[PDB]
Scaffold this motif. Sequence first.
Motif, PDB file in Angstrom:
ATOM      1  N   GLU A   1     -13.064  -7.425  -7.813  1.00  0.00           N
ATOM      2  CA  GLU A   1     -13.044  -7.812  -9.220  1.00  0.00           C
ATOM      3  C   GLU A   1     -11.697  -7.492  -9.857  1.00  0.00           C
ATOM      4  OE1 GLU A   1     -16.227  -6.068 -11.449  1.00  0.00           O
ATOM      5  OE2 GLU A   1     -15.731  -7.214 -13.261  1.00  0.00           O
ATOM      6  N   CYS A   2     -11.131  -6.333  -9.523  1.00  0.00           N
ATOM      7  CA  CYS A   2      -9.822  -5.958 -10.049  1.00  0.00           C
ATOM      8  C   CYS A   2      -8.710  -6.835  -9.468  1.00  0.00           C
ATOM      9  CB  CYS A   2      -9.575  -4.477  -9.763  1.00  0.00           C
ATOM     10  SG  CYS A   2      -7.924  -3.905 -10.205  1.00  0.00           S
ATOM     11  N   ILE A   3      -8.746  -7.073  -8.155  1.00  0.00           N
ATOM     12  CA  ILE A   3      -7.772  -7.948  -7.501  1.00  0.00           C
ATOM     13  C   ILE A   3      -7.770  -9.335  -8.139  1.00  0.00           C
ATOM     14  CG2 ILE A   3      -7.314  -9.147  -5.315  1.00  0.00           C
ATOM     15  CD1 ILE A   3      -8.194  -6.406  -3.970  1.00  0.00           C
ATOM     16  N   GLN A   4      -8.950  -9.838  -8.512  1.00  0.00           N
ATOM     17  CA  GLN A   4      -9.017 -11.137  -9.170  1.00  0.00           C
ATOM     18  C   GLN A   4      -8.261 -11.130 -10.493  1.00  0.00           C
ATOM     19  OE1 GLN A   4     -13.229 -11.938  -9.353  1.00  0.00           O
ATOM     20  NE2 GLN A   4     -13.368 -12.492  -7.174  1.00  0.00           N
ATOM     21  N   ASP A   5      -8.312 -10.014 -11.232  1.00  0.00           N
ATOM     22  CA  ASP A   5      -7.547  -9.925 -12.474  1.00  0.00           C
ATOM     23  C   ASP A   5      -6.044  -9.977 -12.207  1.00  0.00           C
ATOM     24  OD1 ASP A   5      -9.708  -9.933 -14.201  1.00  0.00           O
ATOM     25  OD2 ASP A   5      -9.668  -7.762 -14.574  1.00  0.00           O
ATOM     26  N   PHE A   6      -5.557  -9.271 -11.179  1.00  0.00           N
ATOM     27  CA  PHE A   6      -4.137  -9.390 -10.834  1.00  0.00           C
ATOM     28  C   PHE A   6      -3.786 -10.835 -10.515  1.00  0.00           C
ATOM     29  CE2 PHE A   6      -4.240  -4.783 -10.106  1.00  0.00           C
ATOM     30  CZ  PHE A   6      -2.981  -4.393 -10.523  1.00  0.00           C
ATOM     31  N   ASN A   7      -4.622 -11.498  -9.712  1.00  0.00           N
ATOM     32  CA  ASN A   7      -4.330 -12.873  -9.318  1.00  0.00           C
ATOM     33  C   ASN A   7      -4.345 -13.817 -10.517  1.00  0.00           C
ATOM     34  OD1 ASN A   7      -3.704 -12.657  -6.556  1.00  0.00           O
ATOM     35  ND2 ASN A   7      -5.879 -12.503  -6.022  1.00  0.00           N
TER      36      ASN A   7
ATOM     37  N   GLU B   1       4.056 -10.302  -7.164  1.00  0.00           N
ATOM     38  CA  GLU B   1       2.923 -10.710  -6.338  1.00  0.00           C
ATOM     39  C   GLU B   1       3.124 -10.314  -4.883  1.00  0.00           C
ATOM     40  OE1 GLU B   1       2.047 -14.844  -6.422  1.00  0.00           O
ATOM     41  OE2 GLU B   1       0.350 -14.674  -5.045  1.00  0.00           O
ATOM     42  N   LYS B   2       4.342 -10.481  -4.358  1.00  0.00           N
ATOM     43  CA  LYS B   2       4.610 -10.050  -2.988  1.00  0.00           C
ATOM     44  C   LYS B   2       4.384  -8.554  -2.816  1.00  0.00           C
ATOM     45  CE  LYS B   2       8.262 -13.404  -2.271  1.00  0.00           C
ATOM     46  NZ  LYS B   2       9.709 -13.416  -1.921  1.00  0.00           N
ATOM     47  N   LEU B   3       4.880  -7.742  -3.755  1.00  0.00           N
ATOM     48  CA  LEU B   3       4.673  -6.300  -3.663  1.00  0.00           C
ATOM     49  C   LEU B   3       3.197  -5.960  -3.774  1.00  0.00           C
ATOM     50  CD1 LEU B   3       5.784  -3.532  -3.407  1.00  0.00           C
ATOM     51  CD2 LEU B   3       6.253  -3.482  -5.849  1.00  0.00           C
ATOM     52  N   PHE B   4       2.487  -6.659  -4.658  1.00  0.00           N
ATOM     53  CA  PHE B   4       1.055  -6.452  -4.821  1.00  0.00           C
ATOM     54  C   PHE B   4       0.310  -6.739  -3.524  1.00  0.00           C
ATOM     55  CE2 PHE B   4      -3.023  -8.559  -5.868  1.00  0.00           C
ATOM     56  CZ  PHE B   4      -3.707  -7.444  -6.332  1.00  0.00           C
ATOM     57  N   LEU B   5       0.592  -7.885  -2.900  1.00  0.00           N
ATOM     58  CA  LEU B   5      -0.074  -8.215  -1.643  1.00  0.00           C
ATOM     59  C   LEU B   5       0.262  -7.204  -0.556  1.00  0.00           C
ATOM     60  CD1 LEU B   5       0.234 -12.083  -1.542  1.00  0.00           C
ATOM     61  CD2 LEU B   5      -1.824 -10.711  -1.852  1.00  0.00           C
TER      62      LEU B   5
ATOM     63  N   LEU C   1     -11.127   1.270  -5.739  1.00  0.00           N
ATOM     64  CA  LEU C   1     -10.718   1.138  -7.136  1.00  0.00           C
ATOM     65  C   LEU C   1      -9.825   2.296  -7.565  1.00  0.00           C
ATOM     66  CD1 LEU C   1     -14.073  -0.226  -8.593  1.00  0.00           C
ATOM     67  CD2 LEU C   1     -11.836  -1.320  -8.945  1.00  0.00           C
ATOM     68  N   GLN C   2     -10.094   3.507  -7.063  1.00  0.00           N
ATOM     69  CA  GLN C   2      -9.211   4.629  -7.360  1.00  0.00           C
ATOM     70  C   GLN C   2      -7.815   4.372  -6.819  1.00  0.00           C
ATOM     71  OE1 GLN C   2     -11.518   7.841  -5.577  1.00  0.00           O
ATOM     72  NE2 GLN C   2     -12.207   8.520  -7.603  1.00  0.00           N
ATOM     73  N   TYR C   3      -7.738   3.818  -5.606  1.00  0.00           N
ATOM     74  CA  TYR C   3      -6.467   3.441  -4.999  1.00  0.00           C
ATOM     75  C   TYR C   3      -5.769   2.360  -5.817  1.00  0.00           C
ATOM     76  CZ  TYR C   3      -3.375   1.753  -1.199  1.00  0.00           C
ATOM     77  OH  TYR C   3      -2.288   1.377  -0.441  1.00  0.00           O
ATOM     78  N   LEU C   4      -6.520   1.363  -6.290  1.00  0.00           N
ATOM     79  CA  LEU C   4      -5.909   0.312  -7.096  1.00  0.00           C
ATOM     80  C   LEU C   4      -5.236   0.873  -8.343  1.00  0.00           C
ATOM     81  CD1 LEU C   4      -8.432  -2.641  -6.668  1.00  0.00           C
ATOM     82  CD2 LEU C   4      -6.020  -2.643  -6.023  1.00  0.00           C
ATOM     83  N   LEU C   5      -5.776   1.945  -8.922  1.00  0.00           N
ATOM     84  CA  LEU C   5      -5.109   2.560 -10.067  1.00  0.00           C
ATOM     85  C   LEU C   5      -3.969   3.477  -9.632  1.00  0.00           C
ATOM     86  CD1 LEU C   5      -4.906   3.063 -13.147  1.00  0.00           C
ATOM     87  CD2 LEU C   5      -6.677   4.829 -12.883  1.00  0.00           C
TER      88      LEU C   5
ATOM     89  N   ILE D   1      -5.585  -4.379 -17.211  1.00  0.00           N
ATOM     90  CA  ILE D   1      -6.101  -3.931 -15.925  1.00  0.00           C
ATOM     91  C   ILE D   1      -6.114  -2.411 -15.852  1.00  0.00           C
ATOM     92  CG2 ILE D   1      -5.784  -3.970 -13.455  1.00  0.00           C
ATOM     93  CD1 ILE D   1      -4.503  -6.780 -13.781  1.00  0.00           C
ATOM     94  N   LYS D   2      -5.022  -1.775 -16.287  1.00  0.00           N
ATOM     95  CA  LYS D   2      -4.955  -0.315 -16.273  1.00  0.00           C
ATOM     96  C   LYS D   2      -6.106   0.292 -17.070  1.00  0.00           C
ATOM     97  CE  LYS D   2      -1.689   3.460 -17.220  1.00  0.00           C
ATOM     98  NZ  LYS D   2      -2.442   4.136 -18.311  1.00  0.00           N
ATOM     99  N   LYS D   3      -6.358  -0.234 -18.270  1.00  0.00           N
ATOM    100  CA  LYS D   3      -7.429   0.305 -19.107  1.00  0.00           C
ATOM    101  C   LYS D   3      -8.799   0.075 -18.480  1.00  0.00           C
ATOM    102  CE  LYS D   3      -4.968  -0.071 -23.514  1.00  0.00           C
ATOM    103  NZ  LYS D   3      -4.919  -0.747 -24.840  1.00  0.00           N
TER     104      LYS D   3
END
Length: 125
Positions: free
Chosen positions: A82-88, A112-116, A21-25, A68-70
């Motif tokens: 759970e966070c990835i699901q919000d992006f999707n 989406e491509k960059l996210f994946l 999750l730290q990486y996701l932010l 998502i950021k907040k």
Amino acid sequence: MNPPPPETSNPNKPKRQTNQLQYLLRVVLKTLWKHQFAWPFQQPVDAVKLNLPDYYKIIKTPMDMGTIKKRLENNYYWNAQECIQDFNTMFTNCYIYNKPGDDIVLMAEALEKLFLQKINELPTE
Ligand SMILES: O=c1cc(-c2ccc(O)c(O)c2)oc2c(O)c(O)ccc12
């Protein structure tokens, strides 16, 4: 008309901080945020401002990168999935509200491509 935006805190929901999750932010969200196509996705859709009176008649699970950021900053999520699901949800909302070939859809497709690309490998716990 606009519904209230998605919650970014919920006292009875259990919180968690993980390396993923730290990486996701720090890397995923903060890098996507700077992309030239990120701007439509940095805040909840304002249907009054944008003149999309049907947006929330169609989209029943709104999501955006500002929310998502907040959530990440508040340790709102239990895990990275759970966070990835919000992006999707954010990307699929764009595809659902619009149609293939629209400028906004081309933006979402690129993000989406960059996210994946960035979630392909996550840190280990
Ligand atoms: O899904 C979206 C769709 C649109 C949109 C705007 C004008 C049109 O004529 C149209 O057919 C679609 O605009 C958005 C936006 O501005 C955002 O910030 C985030 C998402 C969207």
